[PDB]
């Protein structure tokens, strides 16, 4: 696993019930800023009007690069 | 997998925007009417408005019986 920060790309959409989560569409480029545990990342991306959207999401939904 | 048809219960919400995907909330009981391939089921349920809806969804998001 590469040291943070690092770029990942969503391989699937992630849409969940929890407010702490980052949600996104497939292909979304995300910056991982914290590895939360063995299975979850915390990271961010900028929405339409340039606002930073951040939260946690499964490592298994993204690929590193 | 048993022989179709069989009942599954959603273990996570599935909220895809793909046309022809079935969407549901966690805990939704669904009848699987066909196995589409190694990763997708096709099935249906009667929604909270009394309407039968159907489409494909991940085998991974549900549990049999």
């Amino acid at each position: 696993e590469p040291e943070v920060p690092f770029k990942v790309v969503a391989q699937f959409p992630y849409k969940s019930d929890y407010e702490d989560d980052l949600n996104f569409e497939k292909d979304q480029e995300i910056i991982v800023t914290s590895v939360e545990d063995a299975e979850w990342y915390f990271g961010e991306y900028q929405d339409s009007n340039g606002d930073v959207i951040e939260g946690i999401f499964p490592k298994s939904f993204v690929a590193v690069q | 997998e048993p022989e179709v048809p069989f009942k599954v219960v959603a273990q996570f919400p599935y909220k895809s925007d793909y046309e022809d995907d079935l969407n549901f909330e966690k805990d939704q009981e669904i009848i699987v009417t066909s196995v589409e391939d190694a990763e997708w089921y096709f099935g249906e349920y009667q929604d909270s408005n009394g309407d039968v809806i159907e489409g494909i969804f991940p085998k991974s998001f549900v549990a049999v019986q």
Partner: peptide, 11 residues
């Protein structure tokens, strides 16, 4: 179709 998403991990 393409690949289905994996089952999300426990929170």
């Amino acid at each position: 179709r393409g690949p289905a998403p994996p089952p999300p991990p426990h929170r």
